[PDB]
Amino acid sequence: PANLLTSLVRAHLDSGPSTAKLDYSKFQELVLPHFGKEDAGDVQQFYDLLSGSLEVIRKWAEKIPGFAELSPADQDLLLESAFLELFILRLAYRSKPGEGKLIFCSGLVLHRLQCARGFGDWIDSILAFSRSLHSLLVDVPAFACLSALVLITDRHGLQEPRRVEELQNRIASCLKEHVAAVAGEPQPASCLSRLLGKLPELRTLCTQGLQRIFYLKLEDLVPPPPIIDKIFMDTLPFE
Amino acid sequence: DAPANLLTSLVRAHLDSGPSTAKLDYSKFQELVLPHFGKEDAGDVQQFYDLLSGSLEVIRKWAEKIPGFAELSPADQDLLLESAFLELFILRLAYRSKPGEGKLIFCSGLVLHRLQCARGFGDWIDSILAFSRSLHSLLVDVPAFACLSALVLITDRHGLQEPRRVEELQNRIASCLKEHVAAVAPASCLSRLLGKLPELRTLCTQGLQRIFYLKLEDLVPPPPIIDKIFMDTLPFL
Ligand SMILES: CCCCCCCC(=O)c1cc(OC)c(OC)c(OC)c1CC(=O)OCC
Ligand SMILES: CCCCCCCC(=O)c1cc(OC)c(OC)c(OC)c1CC(=O)OCC
Ligand code: NA
Structure with missing residues (x-):
């Protein structure tokens, strides 16, 4: 149970790696002592991690x-408007901030420390949010709705804002x-307003993402892939 | 007119573009403010913009x-x-500031x-004060600085209609x-000074990032000419 809840749960679990398909062939806890300060490699990886999720979030949706x-x-x-947020939220839930482990949607x-040069301090902010998300101990069905609600939300330029809003309200x-179906002790609507408290922080984190991309477009070592670029420019709210 | 003629003009342009020790304006100064770090309200952002704008009106009259x-x-x-404004704003602010006292001193006399700049400027202002210490330790005298700032401005830019008249004027300065520098008694002070250029370069980048951030945040609109400078400098636009 139930039919909306089960479809969400299934779309969530199907959009990411099983425990058995995790790929550690690249993982190095020891790296350094160095920097890029930005190397192409770092930047091209940052962008590739980003693009990787695109097709995945689009099939999930x-x-x-x-x-x-x-x-x-x-x-x-x-x-487009939810992309960076869904990327961070799903990464944060998937990763293991206690061990410094980022787990991407490919299984990678x-x-x-492998992400630092590419993402800059952004990775640290994401990790903090992931620490905070983890301690909320959010279950899979709760997560399945929370991410859906990141996607299905009012945006400027909606054609049918009322239909987006009825779809969001169902979710x-x-x-x-x-979260009331887990009744004792909680049944609170404290659990609830705590999980929903995570959406503004997410939007703040997205801005930090746009900041990193602005910085990298500025230095121009390696251009973003056109679809990321389009999201950057389509979502920067300023002729 | 008819001593030291181009030099005299540079010094005189420099000195009239900034405040006398006597014209310093302590009216908003507080040795201790307790800011909420990481955030900013509209008075903060508006002062940041005004500070930028007034600086550019003053750099215009100096030019x-x-x-x-x-x-x-x-x-x-x-x-x-427009192309040198951020460089000149940073170089001139660092040159007149008092980093041993945490004091930023703007062209107006303010x-x-x-601590008071933390909210508008973010980290940038701390990094500008580092450059102040860095600059101050080279002991660049005022006539050297008059020539130097003027050379930051007078330089090749893509899109000049008369690049050779600019280079002619660059040669003159x-x-x-x-x-x-020969009248005042290898790798020289200038070589040493050129070595600080990457710091200045990064501080301009950091300025462009702070403006991006505030535009994203959009508490108040930016001044048009500042917004145009930001927009003109983006290599991807
Ligand atoms: C390489 C750095 C060495 C440290 C010097 C620091 C610059 C300075 O405080 C200074 C000292 C002067 O007197 C020596 C002077 O001329 C009157 C001058 O120009 C206005 C300045 C510059 C200035 O921008 O102040 C106007 C409000
Ligand atoms: C044209 C594309 C060049 C990109 C390089 C970074 C641009 C920048 O930080 C900048 C932007 C300006 O305008 C936004 C500007 O004038 C205010 C300015 O003063 C020299 C600088 C400083 C500078 O160009 O030197 C250090 C980087
Ligand atoms: Na993903």
């Missing part, structure tokens, strides 16, 4: 009941009755 | 005083000014404590600087 029923312009705006496992309702 | 500059084409004067 399609399995959300109702998402395929929004206008195609609305589907593309939600996806990397150490923080929030599903969430609310699921 | 009008460099012999030859005001006879460059209008578009050339604009382009030189004195502000590092270099010969002028050389005469001066």
Whole structure:
């Protein structure tokens, strides 16, 4: 149970690596003593980790009941506008901040110190958020709704903002009755307002992502892939 | 007119572009403010912008005083000014500041404590004060600095209509600087100074990032000419 809750759960679990398909062939806890200060390699990896999730988040979104029923312009705006947030949220939930382990959606496992030069201090902020997310001890169905709710949310330029809002309300309702379905002791709506407290912090983290990309576009060692670029420019709110 | 003529003009342009020890404005200064670090409100951001704008109006009038500059084409004067503004704002602020006391001293005469700049400027201001210490330790005298800042401005820029008249004027100020440093008694102070250029370069980048961040945040609109400088400098636009 139940039918919305189970589709979400399935779309979530299907959009990422099983425990058995994790790839450690690249993971090095020891690296340094060095920097890039930015090397091409760092930057090209940063961007490749980013692009990797694109196709994955896009197929995940399609399995959300109702998402395929929004206008195609609305589907593309939600996806573009939520991309960085979904990338951070899913990374944060997937990773293991106690050990400094980042686990990407391909299955690829990397150490923080392997990510540092590419992501800059951003990786540290993501890790902090992941530490905080972990201690909320959020279950899979709660997570399945939370990420869906990051995607399905009001955005400037929506064609059918009311239909996006009814789809979001179904999801929030599903969430609310699921975290109340674990009743004793909590049943609180404290659990709830704590998990929902994680969305603004996420938006703040996304801004830090846009900051890193601005910085890398500035130095121009290696251009972003056009779809990341398009999201950067389509979502920077300023002729 | 008819001592030291180009040099005299440079010094005189320099000195009239900034405050006398007597004209320092302690009216907003507080030796201790307790800021909420990492965040900023509209008065913070507006002061940051005003500080940038007033600096550019002042750099404009100083430039009008460099012999030859005001006879460059209008578009050339604009382009030189817009292209060097961040460099000049950082170099001039660091040169007159008092980092041993956490004091930023702007061209208008406004004195502000590092703590007071934290919210508008973010980390950038701390890094500018590092460059102040770095600059101050080279003991660049005022006539050397008059020539140096002027050479930051007068330099090749892509899109000049009259690049050779700019290079002609660049040659004039270099010969002028050389005469001066030879009149005041290998890898030289200038070589040493050129060695600080990467610091200045990074501080300009850090300025461009702070402005990006604040535009993203959008508490208040930026001044048009500052916004145009930010936008013109982006190599991807
Ligand atoms: C390489 C750095 C060495 C340390 C010197 C620091 C610069 C300085 O405080 C200074 C000292 C002067 O007197 C010697 C002077 O001329 C009157 C001068 O120009 C206005 C300045 C510069 C200035 O920007 O102040 C105006 C408010
Ligand atoms: C044209 C593309 C060049 C990109 C390089 C970084 C641009 C920058 O930081 C900058 C931007 C400006 O305008 C935004 C500007 O004038 C205010 C300025 O003063 C020299 C600098 C400083 C500078 O160019 O030297 C250190 C980097
Ligand atoms: Na992902």
